[PDB]
Amino acid sequence: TVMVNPKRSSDYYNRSTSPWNLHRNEDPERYPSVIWEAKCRHLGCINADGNVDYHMNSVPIQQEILVLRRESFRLEKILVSVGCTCVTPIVHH
Amino acid sequence: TVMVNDYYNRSTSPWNLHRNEDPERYPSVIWEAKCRHLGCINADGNVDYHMNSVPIQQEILVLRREPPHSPNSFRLEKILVSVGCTCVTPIVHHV
Ligand SMILES: Cc1ccc2ncccc2c1-c1ccc(O)c(C(=O)O)c1
Ligand SMILES: Cc1ccc2ncccc2c1-c1ccc(O)c(C(=O)O)c1
């Protein structure tokens, strides 16, 4: 026991070859109550012609973050998606 | 005041993880991303500067010992962390 005293400001989500949207994650018993989580727009990645390359993969980049939960509060560690990256698939065993 | 109790090696914008350690902080250890290249990896496996690797930055909540060195009193603080990298067009679309 111890004592303790959203925005989208980057355009990377649209300029990325693995672009992403944001989804509202809301929990009234949590601080922050509203978290915006990334969801990749495509299964594949966008090529230089602007079309989807289904061979590559858009995958979410996750971060472990601290949140406060009403329980007087209790500290929790959760995983949130912050954006997406484009990867070459695992193609061997 | 309250009381409290490989995929990136495969990315076209790969990154390496770096230890951010602060004993005055909870969590003490945060693993941050540093993009490996300024370009992105092309289909030949080389760095290509027609596109750029950029680090996605996220504002995260953290506990800071207040007063310093205290084992049971903290202040809520927000810091900017690099979580991973994505591959972007070097151009922007707004004025
Ligand atoms: C990321 C992106 C988004 C929208 C596009 N819309 C039309 C055409 C290309 C687009 C690209 C894109 C992808 C890969 C690339 O290599 C390049 C590039 O080389 O500019 C551009
Ligand atoms: C991401 C990645 C990582 C390592 C590689 N090492 C050798 C060759 C290509 C590599 C690729 C890569 C990049 C873009 C791509 O478009 C493709 C692909 O289309 O296969 C593959």
Author numbering:
A (entry chain A): 44 to 48, 60 to 125, 132 to 153
B (entry chain B): 44 to 48, 65 to 154
Please give sentences taken from the publication describing this entry:
The Interleukin 17 (IL17) family comprises several structurally-related dimeric cytokines that are elicited by infection and other immunological stimuli. The preeminent family member is IL17A3, which forms homodimers and can also heterodimerize with IL17F. IL17 proteins drive and amplify inflammatory responses in a wide variety of cells including keratinocytes, fibroblasts and lymphocytes. Here we present a new class of inhibitor molecules that interact with IL17A at a novel C-terminal binding site.
In addition to Cmpd 5, we also identified a salicylate fragment (Cmpd 7) as a binder to the C-terminal site in IL17A. We solved the co-crystal structure of this compound, and it also displayed two copies that overlaid very nicely with the position of Cmpd 6. Interestingly, one copy of Cmpd 7 was observed to make a water-mediated interaction with His109 through its carboxylic acid moeity (in the analogous position as Cmpd 6’s pyridine). That same water molecule appeared to be further stabilized by Thr148 and the carboxylic acid moiety also utilized another water molecule to engage Asp107. The first was to merge aspects of the quinoline fragment with salicylate fragment by swapping the central pyridyl ring for a benzoic acid to productively engage His109, Thr148, and Asp107 (as seen in the salicylate fragment, Cmpd 7). From this observation and by comparison to another salicylate fragment (Cmpd 7) that we found also bound in this region, we were able to “link” the two copies into a larger molecule.
